[PDB]
């Protein structure tokens, strides 16, 4: 029955959204150019240890406009797309909704191991089907997350050359570290890595490395352990690469903080027909780069085999393991609201039965072979948040304010027609800041946003979308972040103490980054026009639409002339239309400051705003409402000019501007 | 087939009653102007411990009448409301009726709990996958009641600022106490609170603050304990404020009377997936004001999540809990009993399965942060007691009198006009007094004082009406309070156990406080008409309306001149029947005497009633019967003038004089 | 003399389109607004010369 939603769904159906594969393909070979700290500049020589948690790899992107039929030269602006580079956070949470985490079927694994046991004349108890079903289900999720974390550590330590590196393994096993010193790759305030050299478990009778080992003997009882069992052919257990991979995972799991080493035990047990090779813990430098590369390759082979040869869920989990190191930064004052609310992945302890006799599918382009896995992982997350922003900002800007007299009056007290009546919330500042979860949970579950978010995600991903939708719904439904009134200043990574209060104390909780990036990527874009090419503005009507609550970002003429004209091109005067009592026209800004307009004056003397060229804050919600105003031009018919805009971003993809929208 | 009933229903439809949000909006945010003991004056400095159970914040409000034609000016009266603010009382009873208490639905606590118990649970107890055995009763009531009691403690300490203060936590726990001495607060004759310093329970293996703890891990076992289980993520259990909130709730639960403590055990116990954080047992000065406030906030969030995010019943139980220590104080010498029979909330021992992960909602102004919640709870109660008053009085005063050698079979004698046949009972005095539940129940079941109650409460509260209604009815059914021959003297909290005696040995059992407040607040009011503006009065007819079974309060034409010179205005003569027979006339007062009138004489020495000003007892039944009177006038005019009454009260609500009523036009 | 407890001012009770708030402008420029029901004595509070 809703017309607007039907129109949007029809348009989305007619113009399909860009498949994820293009976005993956267009980043596999991207060479970063800037590794400066977010705030300052790179010092002469790199430090010896990753300490300043402010570094960022900057994907520069430039936009400059021109006023056709004029001699004005607007300075070029800069779409600063920042990727956090040294900062640790957690993306694991044991809390799932029904579709959040699935159970990979053990259809092709049980028969093979059954036949193996029968062939080697091992006396087992009970048909393996029911014992598999009840004793040990099949959740290999964890072992991919650790792999992603390892790749992320490698990438981080690679980009930031710490002036005398050792190796992937020498900075990971903590050789020559004081009992209180932190690992080289992660040494700064509020890190998330256990400190000191990691300690190998004691050498027991039978060991295939850092995990237990059980061999199957002809005419001999066989009993499985309690964790996960990975049957392998004897040709592999004696391989160097396999054991090196196993050791690397073990090391990565004993470095994550102490308290998650007792909730997600890294339990595994290799089973085969060899003689227990025993653990051979590498001690001195003996894991050269080529050996580590082989280890990673064999490891990915085993992982892909465990996932029923899916390579899509595996890629998703491997990525979700990486954001723990690489995150996409915000581009607004009150940021860290969307990313902080969509990061968690529901998980279950690792257990079940596996079988690997030989690889079957040859993944051409795995994650770990990309030019820089961190960037590739971060960009996919950026896409997720972009779509989420698109769905959220479907019916307004969703403001939240801190008015002291909050109880005395209800909502819609201050926000005029601009903020859709129903999306403005307030809270008195006497109490602590509310929980963002409260607002977002109510936002997501409305039918209008649900029925569109589902379609968008399905178009982007496909058969594998439902996992992502369920997981994001869970995460947003489970977030502890508060809407703190402070500001971020957009020149840091973590909120600095003593920062000033927000603008008008009104946080806006849709924005995460400019929609021009979404347009370029070819993904769903919110109701903002794409500043792409030639435009034909008309300052009068354009300006009039602004004072009805519209976003200034949709007004090209004003932004172009913000300080080069508009003091000699347009005037503002009260409306004298009827014969009734004359009234002083007034307009209300965001903070409820009713502004009167008595004597007609040049526009620049009535309203002001900073000139960011043509990249202004999209949803700034400048003018809530205005009544009784007229706009007359005082230039001899040169207020309807044309402008040109060029956006040569380096992350443009095939579907340049073919993505859907709301206001084409 | 009841003209009065249909007329009143139509009227109430015409002018809807003000829903409670206006009352909350008005009262939420004013501080009391002055707090003093009910009888006397406050001392120079407050003592160490609240020990006199009379301190009461009061709310002045006056009436001034003004008119020309009288001899001298009329002195003003002081209609002030009081709040008990110190004395304790029980409010929790085990009885029940259909709607008295309801069980919430665990339709959004079972999915998550099952999905979190299926995975992290040793793979040798079998797969559960049934989602049908997790069906324990959901009764998360008592938690809110304890929360309310805690808020009440905080407020009572704040209002009556004692000389040497202590941290709310320190006062509540009471580390530096004596062997069996009372807590720093609530130390007086009527105080009922477990004395002595509070004792932390034990040093067991699995501790998580005051309550039990069970974990679900592979190398463990799982067995849900019997009480309530609050399944939370490992993130919050290791938090700080949450632990403090648990300690606070436990602390307030062990100060209830020992017997009531045994009845309703504190059976909460938490289950999670991480190592048990040992009990902290704060002492000396660990908890402080801001930390306590943070704990309160998180506790409120927890409780809201437990209530299926209802927040209207949550506020109800929280109010009812805070009502054990604040409550309106009656205003009539009768003894202030109408409240005592409406104060009970049914309850059952807490139980169920609860999961808590986030917020799911944000309430702009919860009760616990509104500048002295005690006052707002007390007034939220008063705004219901007044409605009950209005409904009972819908028929008549409903007196109960005492006569010697009354028939111990039936106690229903007709008293005359102004008292309908149903009401107006009688009882022998020398035997124990009646139970006062043998009248109210009979009152609120008739289909005239029922539908009115239904619609009025519906308009006041809306959807969450039934619960209140049902509950109050239950309170009436089992109330042990009894009628007594004594007075409150208007400067007491409880009857002084001496020998106060009734003026007429009778008791009017349907008046609690002056209806003027009811009119001002916009709630329903009956009978008595409002007095705020100019009025046309006809003594020659108003007085006639009086002697045929009225009450003076409606007759504001008389009180103005009661002793300002009504004497030489009107005469009463027996009767001037020009025919059958010249008989003489008489009137009967509330007592038995029937002193008669024979000749013309000034009115001032035939009735001669006490003059309060323009605020007389509304249901006093000054005259019951009178036959054969004329009320001649003795001055041309001078009995058809005007009068102006101004009443200004600080609690004027938003819609003050736009509420329903059915007082004579 | 007591106009306070005689009349209240409230923003508006429009039963339909939108609950917006109201304000008044004095001879100076300031446009201080009114949001809730409140006594008149503290919203305007003009100097009293008599009649």
Question: Layout of helices and strands, plus pairs?
Answer:
This is part of a larger assembly, with three copies of chain A.
Chain A: H1 3-14, H2 20-25, E1 56-59, E2 62-68, E3 77-78, E4 81-84, E5 92-93, H3 110-119, H4 128-135, H5 141-159, E6 212-215, E7 228-232, H6 234-237, H7 240-253, E8 269-272, H8 289-306, H9 313-322, E9 327-328, E10 345-346, E11 352-356, H10 373-392, E12 399-401, E13 425-426, H11 436-444, H12 447-460, H13 465-477, E14 507-508, H14 515-521, E15 535-536, H15 539-546, H16 556-560, E16 570-573, E17 585-589, E18 594-597, E19 601-602, E20 623-627, E21 630-633, E22 642-647
Parallel strand pairs in A: 5-10, 6-8, 7-8, 7-11, 12-13
Antiparallel strand pairs in A: 1-4, 2-3, 2-22, 4-9, 12-14, 15-22, 16-19, 16-21, 17-18, 17-20
Helix pairs in contact in A: 1-12, 5-7, 5-9, 7-8, 10-12, 12-13
Protein name (chain A): Capsid protein
Descriptive report:
It is classed as viral protein. The entry lists the keywords Capsid, Viral Protein. TVV2 capsid protein. Chains A, B, C: Capsid protein. The organism of A, B, C is Trichomonas vaginalis virus 2. The structure is cut from a larger assembly and holds 3 copies of chain A. With 664 residues, the first copy, chain A, is of the alpha/beta class. In chain A, 27% of the residues lie in helices and 12% in strands. The first copy, chain A, is built from 16 helices and 22 strands. The first copy, chain A, has helices at residues 3-14, 20-25, 110-119, 128-135, 141-159, 234-237, 240-253, 289-306, 313-322, 373-392, 436-444, 447-460, 465-477, 515-521, 539-546, 556-560; strands at 56-59, 62-68, 77-78, 81-84, 92-93, 212-215, 228-232, 269-272, 327-328, 345-346, 352-356, 399-401, 425-426, 507-508, 535-536, 570-573, 585-589, 594-597, 601-602, 623-627, 630-633, 642-647. Chain A has a 4-stranded antiparallel sheet. In chain A, helix 5 crosses helix 9 (313-322) and helix 7 packs across helix 8 (289-306). The first copy, chain A, is elongated, with a radius of gyration of 29 Å. The two termini of chain A are 22 Å apart. At the A-B interface, strand 13 and helix 11 of A face helix 3 of B.
